[PDB]
Amino acid sequence: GRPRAFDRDTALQRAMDVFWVRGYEGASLAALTEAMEIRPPSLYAAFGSKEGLFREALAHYLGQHGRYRRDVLDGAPSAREGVAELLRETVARFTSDEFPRGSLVVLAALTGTPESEAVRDALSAERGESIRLFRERMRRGIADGDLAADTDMEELATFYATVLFGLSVQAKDRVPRERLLAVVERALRAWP
Amino acid sequence: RGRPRAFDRDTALQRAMDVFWVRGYEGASLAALTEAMEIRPPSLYAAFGSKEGLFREALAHYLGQHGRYRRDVLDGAPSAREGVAELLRETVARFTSDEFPRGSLVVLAALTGTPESEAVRDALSAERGESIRLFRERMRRGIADGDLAADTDMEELATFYATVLFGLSVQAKDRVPRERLLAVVERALRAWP
DNA sequence: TTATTTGTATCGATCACTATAAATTT
DNA sequence: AAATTTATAGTGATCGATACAAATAA
């Protein structure tokens, strides 16, 4: 029939940016439909609802900013170099302006009304996946021999995840890239 | 002179702060605030002027009643390392108590939002800068006291621990068990120079 | 009488979300 | 045409913030 005037993945990209800056509940459909360059009935045709548009923008954000994480981790010769390389590239992405500062998963919905709890729980489970990414790379380190067998991998993974999440708050606070890279270097001194 | 106010203004302020603590600034609807404060809208505005003003008063209340331990724990410690350790250990305790909302209001209440509330977002961001400054002040004392080296980068060390501190609000909100978060604090202190 | 607080009822604006039909197709 | 996306123009509900008058003090 009549052709579609927008490109799906491009409207999904602009919806992702608005969420990245205003958050899930902070993003009105006025601001969204303005960014995507579509009209409300077009938006609800492709995405179902505001929540459905966020879940698709989350999957979009993740595939474009959450797959580079495991590539850097497993591409390093040791678990310590993986955590170092991934924390350094994260600080780079957190401090260049090709994107907004900080991670969408950390910033988009930490608190809110009871109505948007499903969205908040989604971002919560995704933060647990960051811990799992760390913990999985440490399991390889113990097997490769570069990490002691009696290492508390859950504590080490959670510690560096705490630092990872904290860097989103610091990047949003406009802390310079040089100071964030010193945080990463200092956090590595805690390695066993 | 006039009709007397029928609510404790100190108690109402506490109840707004508890709603802001869980729902954030924009998430706290005026229907929800007046419901917890147990008052009605025109009273709220007579007392606090506006939602923004009510949060700004709730913030100062939260800071003096739930952030008073920070300076005390920091100052009463015999070394800079013990003050940072004890502050984080105490923060994890409060962050994981069954008695208060998990995490810190300052980090959780307004990280992102509409352009209308940037004044509130910058207020909380300035208060997070104070957390960095508060650590920095203690390390300053540690250099004079002798427990810290006279050439230590006070900002680099304070900012690192402020990063760990902010991340603990997110982990507390994610209901990470308390023993886990104390292990995190111990690991972070291993990075001390 | 005056002064301040109270509950009620409502404000204009904005929220997320659609009915409806013209526009553009094979 | 028959199919499908478009834009206009709204929906009721809720947002933050009030006009008003009964109530209650000095």
Q: How many CB pairs under 8 A join A and B?
A: 135
SS3 B65: helix
Radius of gyration of chain A (CA): 19
What CA–CA distance (Å, rounded) separates B103 from B178? Answer: 12
Radius of gyration of chain B (CA): 19
Q: Using what technique was this structure determined?
A: X-ray
What is d(CA A106, CA B93) in angstroms, rounded to the nearest whole number?
A: 22
Which among A12, A16, A26, A11 is positioned nearest to A109, based on CA atoms?
A26
Rounded to a whole number, what is the distance in Å from the CA of A122 to chain B's nearest CA?
11
The packing angle between helices B154-173 and B80-95, to 10°, is 10
Alpha-carbon distance of B102 to B175, in angstroms, equals 8
Interface mutation target, options B121, B187, B189, B192, chain A, most CBs of A under 10 Å: B187
Q: What residues contact B103, with CB distance under 8 A and at least 6 apart? A: B95, B168, B169, B170, B172, B173
> Of the candidates A140, A186, A121, which has an alpha carbon nearest to the alpha carbon of residue A160?
A186
> How many Å apart are A38 CA and D2 C1'?
25
Judged on CB neighbours under 10 Å (0-12, 13-18, 19+), A174 is exposed
Contact of A170 with chain B, judged by CB distance below 8 Å, is answered with yes
Sort out which chain B residues have CB atoms less than 8 A from A167's CB and list them.
163, 167
Q: Which of B170, B173, B176, B179 to mutate to test the interface with A (most CBs of A within 10 A)?
A: B170
- Please provide the DSSP assignment of A82-129 as one string: HHHHHHHHHHHHTTSSSS-SS-HHHHS-SS--GGGHHHHHHHHHHHHH
Asked whether B6 and B97 are in contact (CB, 8 A), the reply is: no
Closest to B64 measured CA to CA, from B111, B33, B105, B125 = B105
Task: Report the distance separating Cα A87 and Cα A85, nearest Å.
Answer: 6
- Whether B107 contacts chain A with CB within 8 A: yes
Cross-chain Cβ contact A23/B166 below 8 Å: no
Question: Would you give the end-to-end CA distance of chain A in angstroms?
Answer: 63
Residues 6 or more apart whose CB falls under 8 angstroms from that of A46 comprise A8, A11
CA-to-CA distance for B81 and A173, rounded, in angstroms?
Answer: 25
Nucleotides in chain D near protein beta carbons (<7 Å): 2-10, 14-20, 23-26
Q: Resolution of this PDB entry, in A?
A: 2.8
Interface test with A, best of B18, B19, B111 (most A CBs within 10 A): B111
Q: CB-based contacts of B10: which residues, under 8 Å, 6+ apart? A: none
Q: A113 to chain B: which residues are within 8 Å by CB?
A: 23, 27, 29, 32
Count of CB atoms situated within 10 Å of the CB of A4: 12
Amino acid at A82: G
Structure tokens at B143: 């250099």
Answer yes or no: do B166 and A164 touch at CB < 8 A. Answer: no
- Considering all nucleic acid strands, name the nucleotide whose C1' atom is nearest to the C-alpha of residue B47: C5
**Which amino acid is residue B51, in one-letter code?**
K
- Supply B63's token pair: 């800071």
User: Which residue from A137, A124, A111, A131 is spatially nearest to A24, judged by alpha carbons?
Assistant: A111
Task: Write b or e for each residue in A22-52: b if 16 or more Cβ atoms lie within 10 A of its Cβ, otherwise e.
Answer: bbbbbbeeebbbebbebeeebbeebbeebee
Return the exposure string of B74-96: e unless at least 16 CB atoms fall within 10 Å of the residue's CB, then b: beebeebbbbbbbbbebbbebbb
